[PDB]
Design an enzyme around this catalytic site. Structure first.
Site, PDB file in Angstrom:
ATOM      1  N   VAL A  77       2.820   9.662  47.132  1.00 18.15           N
ATOM      2  CA  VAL A  77       2.096   8.649  47.847  1.00 18.15           C
ATOM      3  C   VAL A  77       0.579   8.647  47.911  1.00 18.15           C
ATOM      4  O   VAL A  77      -0.072   7.764  48.152  1.00 18.15           O
ATOM      5  CB  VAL A  77       2.706   8.381  49.265  1.00 18.15           C
ATOM      6  N   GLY A  78      -0.010   9.844  47.792  1.00 12.86           N
ATOM      7  CA  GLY A  78      -1.250  10.279  47.844  1.00 12.86           C
ATOM      8  C   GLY A  78      -1.761  11.690  47.994  1.00 12.86           C
ATOM      9  O   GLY A  78      -0.838  12.604  47.546  1.00 12.86           O
ATOM     10  N   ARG A  79      -2.763  12.025  48.208  1.00 14.15           N
ATOM     11  CA  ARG A  79      -3.204  13.288  48.434  1.00 14.15           C
ATOM     12  C   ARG A  79      -4.669  13.556  49.273  1.00 14.15           C
ATOM     13  O   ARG A  79      -5.261  12.540  49.740  1.00 14.15           O
ATOM     14  CB  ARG A  79      -3.797  13.745  47.005  1.00 14.15           C
TER      15      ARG A  79
ATOM     16  N   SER B 121      -3.970  18.926  49.737  1.00 16.93           N
ATOM     17  CA  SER B 121      -2.692  18.738  49.823  1.00 16.93           C
ATOM     18  C   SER B 121      -2.456  17.617  48.980  1.00 16.93           C
ATOM     19  O   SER B 121      -2.940  16.690  48.259  1.00 16.93           O
ATOM     20  CB  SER B 121      -1.928  18.521  51.009  1.00 16.93           C
ATOM     21  N   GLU B 122      -1.141  17.664  48.265  1.00 14.32           N
ATOM     22  CA  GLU B 122      -0.175  16.643  47.743  1.00 14.32           C
ATOM     23  C   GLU B 122       0.705  16.086  48.303  1.00 14.32           C
ATOM     24  O   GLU B 122       1.616  16.756  48.988  1.00 14.32           O
ATOM     25  CB  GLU B 122       0.194  17.193  46.446  1.00 14.32           C
ATOM     26  N   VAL B 123       0.834  14.766  48.576  1.00 15.90           N
ATOM     27  CA  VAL B 123       1.891  14.080  49.527  1.00 15.90           C
ATOM     28  C   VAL B 123       2.803  13.068  48.845  1.00 15.90           C
ATOM     29  O   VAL B 123       2.326  12.503  48.038  1.00 15.90           O
ATOM     30  CB  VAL B 123       0.899  13.148  50.527  1.00 15.90           C
TER      31      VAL B 123
ATOM     32  N   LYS C 107       4.370  16.725  52.808  1.00 13.91           N
ATOM     33  CA  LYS C 107       2.897  17.065  52.621  1.00 13.91           C
ATOM     34  C   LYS C 107       2.964  18.659  52.248  1.00 13.91           C
ATOM     35  O   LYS C 107       2.904  19.413  53.117  1.00 13.91           O
ATOM     36  CB  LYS C 107       2.020  16.661  53.919  1.00 13.91           C
TER      37      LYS C 107
ATOM     38  N   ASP D  46     -11.082  13.753  62.360  1.00 14.98           N
ATOM     39  CA  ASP D  46     -11.192  13.041  60.586  1.00 14.98           C
ATOM     40  C   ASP D  46     -10.765  11.606  60.572  1.00 14.98           C
ATOM     41  O   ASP D  46      -9.823  11.117  59.906  1.00 14.98           O
ATOM     42  CB  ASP D  46     -10.323  13.778  60.003  1.00 14.98           C
TER      43      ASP D  46
HETATM   44  N1  GNP Z   1       2.945   5.391  52.087  1.00 12.04           N
HETATM   45  C1  GNP Z   1       2.251   6.292  52.715  1.00 12.04           C
HETATM   46  N2  GNP Z   1       1.622   7.176  52.466  1.00 12.04           N
HETATM   47  C2  GNP Z   1       1.207   8.125  52.970  1.00 12.04           C
HETATM   48  C3  GNP Z   1       2.035   8.612  54.288  1.00 12.04           C
HETATM   49  N3  GNP Z   1       1.294   9.542  54.680  1.00 12.04           N
HETATM   50  C4  GNP Z   1       0.279   9.894  53.982  1.00 12.04           C
HETATM   51  N4  GNP Z   1       0.296   9.102  53.089  1.00 12.04           N
HETATM   52  C5  GNP Z   1      -0.847   9.320  51.870  1.00 12.04           C
HETATM   53  O1  GNP Z   1      -1.171  10.282  51.710  1.00 12.04           O
HETATM   54  C6  GNP Z   1      -2.662  10.526  51.976  1.00 12.04           C
HETATM   55  C7  GNP Z   1      -2.744  11.981  52.581  1.00 12.04           C
HETATM   56  O2  GNP Z   1      -2.077  12.498  53.456  1.00 12.04           O
HETATM   57  P1  GNP Z   1      -2.854  13.377  54.472  1.00 12.04           P
HETATM   58  O3  GNP Z   1      -2.128  13.857  55.654  1.00 12.04           O
HETATM   59  O4  GNP Z   1      -4.375  12.614  55.006  1.00 12.04           O
HETATM   60  O5  GNP Z   1      -3.455  14.753  53.554  1.00 12.04           O
HETATM   61  P2  GNP Z   1      -4.778  15.394  53.607  1.00 12.04           P
HETATM   62  O6  GNP Z   1      -4.761  16.201  52.500  1.00 12.04           O
HETATM   63  O7  GNP Z   1      -4.988  16.635  54.733  1.00 12.04           O
HETATM   64  N5  GNP Z   1      -6.046  14.416  53.488  1.00 12.04           N
HETATM   65  P3  GNP Z   1      -7.823  14.596  54.121  1.00 12.04           P
HETATM   66  O8  GNP Z   1      -8.602  14.925  52.675  1.00 12.04           O
HETATM   67  O9  GNP Z   1      -8.220  13.421  54.501  1.00 12.04           O
HETATM   68  O10 GNP Z   1      -7.894  15.915  54.783  1.00 12.04           O
HETATM   69  C8  GNP Z   1      -2.887   9.381  52.814  1.00 12.04           C
HETATM   70  O11 GNP Z   1      -4.211   9.134  52.989  1.00 12.04           O
HETATM   71  C9  GNP Z   1      -1.853   8.379  52.552  1.00 12.04           C
HETATM   72  O12 GNP Z   1      -2.474   7.367  51.626  1.00 12.04           O
HETATM   73  C10 GNP Z   1       2.857   7.640  54.806  1.00 12.04           C
HETATM   74  O13 GNP Z   1       3.671   7.982  55.731  1.00 12.04           O
HETATM   75  N6  GNP Z   1       3.167   6.801  53.991  1.00 12.04           N
HETATM   76 MG    MG Z   2      -6.340  12.474  54.942  1.00 11.03          MG
END
Ligand code: GNP
Ligand code: MG
Length: 367
Positions: free
Chosen positions: A46-48, A49-51, A66, A190
């Site tokens: 769903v996005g990116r 850690s890799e999520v 995550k 953030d």
């Molecule tokens: N559809 C959906 N996408 C999600 C959810 N949680 C996270 N994501 C996707 O995954 C991305 C990354 O999650 P995040 O916890 O911000 O990870 P991070 O590596 O700490 N990112 P950052 O560079 O901001 O520190 C989010 O921006 C979002 O697009 C969710 O509950 N639902």
């Molecule tokens: Mg984030």
């Protein structure tokens, strides 16, 4: 101590004196990682850690996984997430006590108390993403956090769809989340659209990504390598380390300005140094200099002296494409009171929730 002039949070100042090591001492915890032999199936990224979006195998409920690549910071993120989700009686649900809210008693800080404030209980705790589990992959042993799933639409797709009233609604939800975490003695650090999940059909908003969040301790000097470039407040860019919750209100204001003026990002720096220059080109050098003088800040080694720029009034960002959002006095005043160099001058989350711009949202609360 780097800072010459010391600063304390205007509100919620002493939360981490009220609360003890059991609450904020994340270094002295041991994480119980649960090996994922049968609990969570990983489905699509769903996005990116890799999520990833996945499924709880027992209940079949969607969750988020995550995947983590930083041991101390992981312990901090977990402690913060659990502190926020486990509080039995969130402070923001109790009756308002003004003297327990405005806790910084400098005379010069009390002049920033606004004549408006949201003084009611609210459910901002419910807008914090919930951590469900702490796991390791059973084969690779890679650590991961398991969260509540939100049916998000990326802000670049969703925001252009939102009406003025909808933006007011969601930004009020975000302020409720921030008021709650600040009341819990935590700075998110953030705040940005990528970290705000919105399920529009259900009018559901969740503040996610607590990996940069930190406990607020009075006169602590923090790392300024936090937030993300476009949303970094001036305190981070000038290396004023004794910052507080008000960092999040800068980020909030930048997010708000981007939505209202349809200019994303709003302050588009091409480097760390240029990010500050982009801010000063809007807010102006005069007030910048006054700010450096108030705190006796010397700019970090990368900076030449700031060139002279005359303040650009907010109305100059108005155009026919955004006037349906920007064409009232209230939004301009709200933005102006959030995007201030001096962190002490910025509206707090409760003050912002009390602002006239949110009157239509407040009027619909009571049923
Ligand atoms: N559809 C959906 N996408 C999600 C959810 N949680 C996270 N994501 C996707 O995954 C991305 C990354 O999650 P995040 O916890 O911000 O990870 P991070 O590596 O700490 N990112 P950052 O560079 O901001 O520190 C989010 O921006 C979002 O697009 C969710 O509950 N639902
Ligand atoms: Mg984030």
């Amino acid at each position: 101590m780097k800072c010459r002039v010391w600063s304390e949070a205007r509100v919620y100042t002493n939360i981490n004196k009220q609360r003890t090591e059991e609450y904020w001492d994340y270094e002295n915890t041991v994480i119980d990682w649960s090996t994922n032999t049968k609990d969570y199936e990983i489905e699509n990224k769903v996005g990116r850690s890799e999520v990833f979006q996945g499924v709880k195998l027992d209940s079949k409920v969607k969750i988020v996984i995550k995947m983590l690549k930083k041991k101390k910071k992981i312990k901090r993120e977990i402690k913060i997430l659990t502190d926020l989700s486990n509080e039995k009686v969130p402070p923001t649900t109790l009756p308002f006590q003004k003297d327990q809210y405005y806790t910084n008693q400098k005379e010069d800080v009390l002049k920033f108390i606004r004549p408006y404030i949201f003084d009611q209980p609210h459910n901002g705790h419910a807008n914090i993403i919930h951590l469900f589990d702490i796991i390791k992959d059973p084969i690779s042993k890679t650590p991961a956090l398991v969260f509540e799933y939100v049916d998000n639409v990326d802000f670049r797709i969703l925001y252009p769809k939102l009406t003025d009233l909808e933006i007011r609604f969601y930004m009020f939800e975000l302020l409720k989340a921030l008021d709650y975490c600040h009341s819990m003695g935590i700075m998110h650090r953030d705040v940005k659209p990528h970290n705000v999940m919105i399920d529009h059909k259900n009018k559901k908003l969740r503040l996610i990504d607590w990996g940069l969040a930190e406990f607020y301790h009075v006169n602590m000097e923090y790392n300024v390598r936090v937030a993300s470039r476009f949303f970094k407040g001036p305190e981070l860019l000038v290396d004023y380390r004794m910052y507080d919750y008000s960092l999040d209100l800068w980020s909030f204001g930048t997010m708000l300005a981007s939505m209202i003026f349809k200019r994303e990002p709003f302050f588009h720096g091409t480097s760390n140094t240029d990010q500050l220059v982009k801010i000063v080109k809007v807010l102006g050098t005069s007030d910048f200099e006054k700010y450096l003088l108030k705190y006796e800040i010397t700019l970090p080694r990368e900076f030449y002296d700031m060139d002279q720029y005359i303040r650009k009034p907010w109305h100059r960002f108005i155009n026919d494409g955004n006037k349906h959002l920007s064409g009232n006095d209230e939004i301009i005043d709200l933005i102006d009171n959030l995007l201030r160099y001096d962190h002490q001058e910025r509206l707090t989350a409760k003050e912002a929730m009390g602002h006239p711009w949110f009157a239509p949202i407040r009027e619909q609360i009571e049923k």
